[PDB]
Protein backbone atom coordinates (compact mmCIF):
# COMPACT_ATOMS: atom_id res chain seq x y z
CA UNK A 1 0.00 0.00 0.00
CA UNK A 2 0.93 3.69 0.19
CA UNK A 3 -0.19 5.98 3.01
CA UNK A 4 -0.06 9.76 3.32
CA UNK A 5 -1.06 11.90 6.29
CA UNK A 6 -4.70 11.72 5.18
CA UNK A 7 -5.10 8.92 2.58
CA UNK A 8 -4.29 5.25 2.02
CA UNK A 9 -3.76 4.00 -1.56
CA UNK A 10 -4.24 0.33 -2.48
CA UNK A 11 -3.33 -1.35 -5.76
CA UNK A 12 -5.68 -4.28 -6.40
CA UNK A 13 -4.17 -6.79 -8.85
CA UNK A 14 -7.50 -8.07 -10.15
CA UNK A 15 -8.56 -7.40 -13.75
CA UNK A 16 -11.93 -5.64 -13.70
CA UNK A 17 -14.04 -3.29 -15.77
CA UNK A 18 -14.25 0.30 -14.49
CA UNK A 19 -17.62 -0.05 -12.77
CA UNK A 20 -16.67 -3.30 -11.02
CA UNK A 21 -13.43 -1.65 -9.96
CA UNK A 22 -15.33 1.28 -8.39
CA UNK A 23 -17.75 -1.03 -6.55
CA UNK A 24 -14.83 -3.07 -5.22
CA UNK A 25 -13.20 0.11 -3.89
CA UNK A 26 -16.50 1.21 -2.32
CA UNK A 27 -16.98 -2.13 -0.57
CA UNK A 28 -13.42 -1.87 0.77
CA UNK A 29 -14.42 1.45 2.31
CA UNK A 30 -13.24 3.95 -0.31
CA UNK A 31 -13.31 4.86 -3.98
CA UNK A 32 -11.18 4.61 -7.11
CA UNK A 33 -8.15 6.79 -6.43
CA UNK A 34 -8.54 10.51 -7.25
CA UNK A 35 -5.32 12.29 -8.23
CA UNK A 36 -6.37 15.86 -7.44
CA UNK A 37 -2.83 17.18 -6.91
CA UNK A 38 0.75 16.45 -7.95
CA UNK A 39 1.69 14.61 -4.76
CA UNK A 40 -1.16 12.12 -5.03
CA UNK A 41 -0.63 11.76 -8.78
CA UNK A 42 3.08 11.00 -8.58
CA UNK A 43 2.51 8.67 -5.65
CA UNK A 44 -0.02 6.63 -7.61
CA UNK A 45 2.31 6.50 -10.61
CA UNK A 46 5.32 5.42 -8.55
CA UNK A 47 3.16 2.76 -6.90
CA UNK A 48 1.90 1.14 -10.09
CA UNK A 49 5.34 1.33 -11.71
CA UNK A 50 7.01 -0.22 -8.66
CA UNK A 51 4.53 -3.09 -9.06
CA UNK A 52 5.72 -3.70 -12.63
CA UNK A 53 2.52 -2.42 -14.28
CA UNK A 54 2.04 -0.30 -17.40
CA UNK A 55 -1.41 1.08 -16.50
CA UNK A 56 -4.27 0.95 -13.97
CA UNK A 57 -7.80 2.30 -13.74
CA UNK A 58 -8.12 5.47 -11.63
CA UNK A 59 -11.18 7.36 -10.47
CA UNK A 60 -11.84 9.83 -13.30
CA UNK A 61 -14.58 9.52 -15.93
CA UNK A 62 -16.95 11.48 -18.20
CA UNK A 63 -19.71 8.85 -18.17
CA UNK A 64 -22.58 11.12 -17.21
CA UNK A 65 -21.90 14.02 -19.61
CA UNK A 66 -19.52 13.57 -22.54
CA UNK A 67 -16.47 15.78 -22.12
CA UNK A 68 -17.38 16.73 -18.52
CA UNK A 69 -14.86 14.77 -16.48
CA UNK A 70 -15.40 14.13 -12.76
CA UNK A 71 -13.57 12.24 -10.03
CA UNK A 72 -15.06 9.12 -8.45
CA UNK A 73 -16.63 11.32 -5.74
CA UNK A 74 -18.47 13.12 -8.63
CA UNK A 75 -16.57 16.33 -8.02
CA UNK A 76 -15.54 18.08 -11.24
CA UNK A 77 -12.15 18.17 -12.85
CA UNK A 78 -10.29 21.30 -11.78
CA UNK A 79 -7.27 23.14 -13.19
CA UNK A 80 -4.84 20.38 -12.25
CA UNK A 81 -4.70 17.57 -14.79
CA UNK A 82 -2.13 15.12 -16.18
CA UNK A 83 -3.73 14.36 -19.56
CA UNK A 84 -1.25 13.11 -22.14
CA UNK A 85 -0.95 15.29 -25.22
CA UNK A 86 -4.23 15.31 -27.15
CA UNK A 87 -6.18 13.54 -24.42
CA UNK A 88 -8.96 13.09 -23.50
CA UNK A 89 -9.79 12.35 -27.15
CA UNK A 90 -12.94 10.20 -26.71
CA UNK A 91 -11.44 7.83 -29.26
CA UNK A 92 -14.01 6.15 -31.53
CA UNK A 93 -16.65 7.94 -29.36
CA UNK A 94 -16.27 5.17 -26.81
CA UNK A 95 -13.77 6.37 -24.16
CA UNK A 96 -15.38 7.48 -20.90
CA UNK A 97 -13.01 6.10 -18.17
CA UNK A 98 -9.40 6.97 -17.35
CA UNK A 99 -6.21 4.94 -17.08
CA UNK A 100 -3.00 6.17 -15.49
CA UNK A 101 0.16 4.98 -17.20
CA UNK A 102 3.54 4.46 -15.52
CA UNK A 103 4.71 7.97 -16.46
CA UNK A 104 1.83 9.34 -14.37
CA UNK A 105 -0.07 10.67 -17.40
CA UNK A 106 -3.78 10.11 -17.99
CA UNK A 107 -5.58 8.67 -20.98
CA UNK A 108 -9.29 8.10 -21.46
CA UNK A 109 -10.16 4.52 -22.46
CA UNK A 110 -13.31 2.45 -23.00
CA UNK A 111 -14.92 1.58 -19.66
CA UNK A 112 -15.33 -2.05 -20.79
CA UNK A 113 -11.54 -2.41 -20.93
CA UNK A 114 -10.23 -4.61 -18.10
CA UNK A 115 -7.13 -3.83 -16.07
CA UNK A 116 -5.88 -3.60 -12.48
CA UNK A 117 -7.08 -0.66 -10.42
CA UNK A 118 -6.14 1.60 -7.52
CA UNK A 119 -8.39 2.48 -4.58
CA UNK A 120 -8.03 5.35 -2.15
CA UNK A 121 -9.29 5.43 1.44
CA UNK A 122 -9.71 8.36 3.81
CA UNK A 123 -8.05 7.52 7.11
CA UNK A 124 -10.83 9.22 9.09
CA UNK A 125 -13.09 6.45 7.67
CA UNK A 126 -10.69 3.56 8.33
C1 LIG B 1 0.03 8.42 11.21
C2 LIG B 1 1.12 8.33 10.16
O1 LIG B 1 0.57 8.93 8.97
C3 LIG B 1 1.42 9.03 7.85
O2 LIG B 1 2.37 10.08 7.92
C4 LIG B 1 2.20 7.72 7.51
O3 LIG B 1 3.44 7.99 6.82
C5 LIG B 1 2.52 6.80 8.71
O4 LIG B 1 2.48 5.44 8.24
C6 LIG B 1 1.56 6.89 9.91
O5 LIG B 1 0.42 6.04 9.71
C1 LIG C 1 -4.33 3.08 -28.61
C2 LIG C 1 -5.17 4.34 -28.49
O1 LIG C 1 -4.25 5.47 -28.68
C3 LIG C 1 -4.77 6.77 -28.52
O2 LIG C 1 -5.72 7.13 -29.50
C4 LIG C 1 -5.51 6.90 -27.17
O3 LIG C 1 -6.14 8.17 -27.03
C5 LIG C 1 -6.55 5.81 -27.07
O4 LIG C 1 -7.25 5.90 -25.84
C6 LIG C 1 -5.89 4.43 -27.15
O5 LIG C 1 -4.92 4.26 -26.11
C1 LIG D 1 1.68 3.34 -22.42
C2 LIG D 1 0.64 4.25 -22.98
O1 LIG D 1 -0.66 3.56 -22.90
C3 LIG D 1 -1.77 4.29 -23.57
O2 LIG D 1 -2.88 3.50 -23.49
C4 LIG D 1 -1.41 4.59 -25.02
O3 LIG D 1 -2.49 5.36 -25.59
C5 LIG D 1 -0.13 5.35 -25.11
O4 LIG D 1 0.24 5.56 -26.51
C6 LIG D 1 0.99 4.63 -24.43
O5 LIG D 1 1.24 3.43 -25.16
CA1 LIG E 1 -19.34 9.28 -23.81
CA1 LIG F 1 -15.71 10.48 -23.18
CA1 LIG G 1 -7.91 8.28 -25.26
Numbering used by the authors: 146 to 271
What does the paper say about this structure?
Of particular interest is the pattern-recognition molecule collectin-11 (CL-11), whose structure resembles the better known C-type lectin mannose-binding lectin (MBL), but which differs because it is produced ubiquitously at epithelial surfaces including the respiratory tract whereas MBL is exclusively expressed in hepatocytes and the circulation. The fundamental subunit of CL-11 includes a carbohydrate-recognition domain (CRD) and a collagen-like domain (CLD). These subunits combine to form multivalent trimers and multiples of trimers with potential for cross-linking carbohydrate ligands, typically fucosylated glycans and high-mannose oligosaccharides. Upon contact with pathogen-associated or damage-associated glycan ligands, CL-11 interacts with other locally produced complement components resulting in lectin complement pathway activation.
Collectively these data indicate that interaction between the SARS-CoV-2 spike protein and CL-11 is mediated by the CRD of CL-11, an interaction which is blocked in the presence of high concentrations of L-fucose. To understand how L-fucose so ably blocks the CRD of CL-11 and thereby prevents CL-11 binding to relevant ligands, e.g., oligomannose- or complex-type glycan ligands that can occur at N-glycosylation sites of the spike protein, we examined the crystal structure of complexes formed between the CRD of CL-11 and L-fucose (30). The crystal contained two CRD molecules in the asymmetric unit each bound to three Ca2+ ions. Density for fucose was observed in the primary binding site of each CRD. The equatorial 2- and 3-hydroxyl groups of the fucose bound directly to the Ca2+ and form polar contacts with Ca2+-coordinating residues: Glu232, Asn234, Glu240, and Asn252. Unexpectedly, density for a second fucose occurred in the adjacent subsite of one of the CRDs, forming hydrogen bonds with the side chains of Glu244 and Arg200 and packing against the side chain of Arg229. This subsite was inaccessible to ligand in the second CRD because of crystal contacts. Here, we show in complexes formed between the CRD of CL-11 and L-fucose that the carbohydrate-binding site is occupied by two such monosaccharides, the second L-fucose unusually occupying the framework structure of the CRD away from the Ca2+-binding site containing the first L-fucose. This unexpected feature of L-fucose interacting with both subsites of CL-11 justifies the use of L-fucose to block CL-11 binding both to natural oligomannose or complex fucosylated ligands that may be present on SARS-CoV-2 and injured RECs.
